[PDB]
Amino acid sequence: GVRTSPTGEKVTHTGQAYDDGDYRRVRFSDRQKEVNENFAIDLIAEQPVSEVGSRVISCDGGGGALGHPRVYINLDKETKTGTCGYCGLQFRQPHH
Amino acid sequence: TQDTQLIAVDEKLDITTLTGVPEEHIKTRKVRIFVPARNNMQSGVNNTKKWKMEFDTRERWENPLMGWSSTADPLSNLVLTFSTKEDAVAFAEKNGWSFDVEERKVPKPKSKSYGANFSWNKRTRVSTK
Amino acid sequence: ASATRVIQLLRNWASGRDLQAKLQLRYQEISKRTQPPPKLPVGPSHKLSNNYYCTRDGRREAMPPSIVMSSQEKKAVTPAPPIKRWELSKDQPYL
Amino acid sequence: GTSVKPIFSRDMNEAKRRVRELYRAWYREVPNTVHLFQLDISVKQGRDKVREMFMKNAHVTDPRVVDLLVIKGKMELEETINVWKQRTHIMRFFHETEAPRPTDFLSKFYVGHDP
Amino acid sequence: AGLLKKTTGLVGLAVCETPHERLKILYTKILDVLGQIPKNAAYRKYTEQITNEKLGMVKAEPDVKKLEEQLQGGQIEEVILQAENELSLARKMLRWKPWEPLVEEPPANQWKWPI
Amino acid sequence: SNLIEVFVDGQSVMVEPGTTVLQACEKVGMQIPRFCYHERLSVAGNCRMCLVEIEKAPKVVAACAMPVMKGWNILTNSEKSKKAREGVMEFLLANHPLDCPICDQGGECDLQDQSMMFGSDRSRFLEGKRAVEDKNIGPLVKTIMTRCIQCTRCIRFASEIAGVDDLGTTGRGNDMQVGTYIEKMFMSELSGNIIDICPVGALTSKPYAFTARPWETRKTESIDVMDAVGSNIVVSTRTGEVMRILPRMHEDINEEWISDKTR
Amino acid sequence: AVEKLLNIQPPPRAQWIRVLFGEITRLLNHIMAVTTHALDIGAMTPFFWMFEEREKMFEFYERVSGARMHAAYIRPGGVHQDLPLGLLDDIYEFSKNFSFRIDELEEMLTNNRIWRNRTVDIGVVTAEDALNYGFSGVMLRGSGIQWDLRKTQPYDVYDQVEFDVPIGSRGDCYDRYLCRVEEMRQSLRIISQCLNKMPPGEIKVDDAKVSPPKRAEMKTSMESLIHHFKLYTEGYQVPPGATYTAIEAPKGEFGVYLVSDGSSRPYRCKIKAPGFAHLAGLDKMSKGHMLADVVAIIGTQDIVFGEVDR
Amino acid sequence: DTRPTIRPRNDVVHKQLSAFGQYVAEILPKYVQQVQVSCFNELEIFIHPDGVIPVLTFLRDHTNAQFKSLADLTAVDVPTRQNRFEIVYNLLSLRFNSRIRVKTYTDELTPIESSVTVYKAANWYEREIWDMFGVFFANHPDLRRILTDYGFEGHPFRKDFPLSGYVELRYDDEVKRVVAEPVELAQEFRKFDLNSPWEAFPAYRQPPE
Amino acid sequence: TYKFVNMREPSMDMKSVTDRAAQTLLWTELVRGLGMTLSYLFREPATINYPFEKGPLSPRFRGEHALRRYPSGEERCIACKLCEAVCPAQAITIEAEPRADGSRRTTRYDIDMTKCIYCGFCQEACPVDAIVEGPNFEFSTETHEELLYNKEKLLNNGDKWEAEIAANIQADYLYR
Ligand code: SF4
């Protein structure tokens, strides 16, 4: 979620906000600070974890050639989830 | 050797007045003449074959608008390549650049023996393969 | 294409040619702005066997220049055979 | 080879002769430059600038380098005479906008890292 | 000699009304200039060979069109122009003496590529 | 004076006995392809990338491990040598993950570079790839182990140079994995050197992760002051910021290693 | 030039596409040259009529590449991507009507006693003097020199296409204008054969160490991903060597002297532009002419200073 | 041709150009240092700098050469050579439908002869070489800058000249004119080290030192 | 093959000479020019009523840049820096680091749109279709500074134009 700085400046998804003594805040006066309000980390955190029944699962991001390079994810660790290193989708074996 | 009206000239070639380089970037610069080290990330040796001339790195600050890396050094990216050290030092001398040149570091020859991995009485024997 | 018969006749006469058959404004004759998906073919080396890259590597067949003379009865020659004379056109020799 | 071929001058005196001719031409041109370009400087200022430009290269001993310097000076003179240069080009010898850079060790130490 | 052309098609290239005599005198002049060049010169041998071949063609063929076809040098006015160019070249080669050995070898790695 | 005479593409060289094919090619300026071979490590001869044709010999030999014989002619560019390299690269890339955009090795890999220079340009592998689970060996080396090509460089280094026998291989065949079996930290003053010797992005620096690409960094050669050894180092910088520290070879001081404090 | 240095060959379909769009480009350039020449002389009207056709050809450019002018579409190895479906039909629709526009352009200029008074016997250059001044293209064939790179030294599939080379007789501005107009007509003639003889197949060399793989293979195959990565970060290495390759550009002989040191970046790239040599000859061609004739002589040498100055 | 990707080699033109290179070397031994033909059939003549006018005039005027057109005249900077500047003449023969390249060399202080008497096209090419590389051409009818700004110092196409040069231009409101200042970049050019540590082309391998 | 463009000699008989004299004295070809312009006056103009009517484009059109997401809302960019490496104008500036969830994501992604040449090489290099050139071409600004795009600016461009960006990509990806 997009929060606010103690000065009232809006904090971006990279965690950027000028401190209270930074003169560079004058650039936003009589203007606005451009912040994208769709934090991708919080959005990918909302996706469920797929209960696929295999030790190795494949993920290409969905949409075939319109996704990402196809990768194979190991699902042998029973404490962690196997997540795709391209799009963040998570996978796990059924109910351990 | 040819009919060119050979005129006697000193053997200290100095083209600094003709290069158009501002005077600050001749006396105060210090170039490095070296064979670049092998990038330890790879085991390829094809980048350690020629001599390089690089200038001393000056100040880079942060652009107030975008946070970019600014410079006031015209020679920050200037990198010349040479076949031998002698060519590099001649080029640095005729251009009036103070230089320090370091000797090329090549790998020393090494005695590799696969059969040592299974030595009967030496510590070179490996416990795993 | 909306011009009246009389205006078409006037402009055909003024230009001296029937300009209604070669209108410079495009109409329903153009191709649809939505097209079926394509299916592009693959190249000659999309093979599963008999395809080693060493047999189709153009860059690694380049050679350094052939030195035919270095300072370090034969007939005279030309760089190439003299160029043939161009012959006149058959569609329209004189424009 | 052991020796080299000249540009024009086979000796240092010939190079000096051509340098003096070029200096003469520039010295006579300066008043016409001041008038024609409508420069806000004096003729004394312009001729002192010409002299100071000549004095930058006084350390040159190679007759070929002197010859090339004379060639470039004549080129600059012809750009000035034929009004190929603008007023901005003539006024670039005088770095009026650039601030006085420090010269002593202490001020350079104060303002940054450059030697 | 056939019907005289109204034009050679090329701007500035006037029609020659007497191309055979023109070519004969040009080739004889060329052969005269080559006689001064030393016998062992490759230029002398090669240019004599080609010049005498062309001259024999200009002597075995009366008609201009078949002579042009046999010479393989374009139109006969173009052949005449090439003959004048070769005469000028031979006169210059008489002074240049390119049959002499090489003036000077290049430095050790003057032509080595890549460096 | 006991040098023997061998030929590398017909060019004669005089080598000490026991010199391998790879070294004899190295002294004419030809670098044989390799993954598992490191000159400072023991010879493994497992990646098979160094296979080369000996003239008149029907079977290729591992250049890294085979001592030259008198009168041998090494054919480093014959078609048989190229086909051996292409087959080996195909086998190495069969189960390799498609991680180049997300792998820190990209741009200075070795697998990438030798795929470009010695392997084919396309795949005929029509199956599902291997995937192994990651190992945690401390906060310094990120082990994305499904990128591992099993060259055993890390194991050989850990056992010989560092003197700790923690790295190894478990299982056999296609599911043979490099690691510690148990969950154990790879703590050693020299631990970070298995990152550089690793030819692929299997072993990577955790502090350096995702932060820079090899081509954009400026490389300043300097000396380490974290101790009195004076190890020669390269300082990678980008846009006025120090990015990482790499070893710089000096045979007399640090060879191609630095300590973890230096790194 | 880069493909010659790489010792690789573009595919036949890519070559046919390159020839077709080179002739489309020649139409664009000749329209601009003739109409701006006329506009400078004082005939503003033909400029607009033909710039509508220029806009349509801009649409062809954008449909093939996404950019109206700077396509970046023709690349060492072939072309970037294939033609979209229905593009050949639209090119055919445009070309079948374009000669009528050349007719209207000639109905205003070719026989006009004022246009000829401004171009006949203006800027006359001798054929030999054209050769010695480094002239090329129309500036050569205006003086009757029978020389065209597309025929004498063909490139791509130009040897398989039939066309005529218009040849002048007086070496003046009027003859060069007629040559450019007839070159537009012959460009239409070539375009027709390109439309009818476009072959199937790929549009870049099937060698992933020069031309990048298809995005579908890049996202599926290890070798394709590696080669995509390396081609888009380092680039392909070109074997060391130097070449001078020239084409018959619409403005004359356009060439490049490209030096390669063996790396992925050119060591030296000298660009030969016909306009450089042509504008070097302005002083010669303007001798004994009025001030208004120099405007015509500049227009007949059609000069773009992007290539004059580089 | 079962090799649709490799560029086809034409051996007839290679032989023709080889024979003509032998011919040219034999006719002018005084100036020809080396002649070679590329794998893509391009013939180069390496000459002593003294032989520029003789060799060029021979190639223009000889009835077996007839290289009437000067396609291009440029220079190449190679700092590792004592004669760093490589002068390249590209010539075209319409009569024999052939091209030839003539190369020589020079350093910063030795003048090359002007070839404007051989080709009128050389007038602007030699001015451009002088402008961008600093090579003087003796007996040039009008030698001066052609491409660079008036009063520009340096020769930008030299390999040791910085990409953005040394001065910028901007309008200054105090002095009411455009002024020149030392160059400052809000974002400096980012130098990329792209070369692979592995050898690409074994056939071009230089022998070890 | 070649052809002559001006190699016709006029006929020199009574009728032809009189034809040319009448053309000289009665200005007949000038009347033909007047007729051509008069015929063009009665043709429908090719002008379109901008901005109410727009020039036709194609799905390949290269306009304003945008950063895209997966349907999950997760960013596509995994900071490989291929676009920055290939950028002919060096218009792309990238900084990255591990995200708090461990993802490989950018912390800086700038495009100097006044350095950009709009070549589309970045969207070719991108392995995940993260950076694209969108259809927008009407984004002129009153100041130079609004053309130095941020990661937030480019992500907002992606969220703004994704509906038609995705349709264009679906239209053209089979050619890529
Ligand atoms: S290790 Fe090399 S080949 Fe494997 S994913 Fe990383 S960069 Fe690509």
Ligand code: SF4
């Ligand atoms: S982790 Fe790296 S060094 Fe160790 S075996 Fe695998 S690839 Fe080799």
Ligand code: SF4
């Ligand atoms: S369109 Fe081209 S210039 Fe613009 S950011 Fe992308 S790669 Fe760079």
Ligand code: SF4
């Ligand atoms: S936008 Fe695409 S190419 Fe650029 S860094 Fe992100 S993933 Fe890589």
Ligand code: FES
């Ligand atoms: S290098 Fe010899 S087998 Fe791995």
Ligand SMILES: [K+]
């Ligand atoms: K590694």
Ligand SMILES: [Zn+2]
């Ligand atoms: Zn995924």
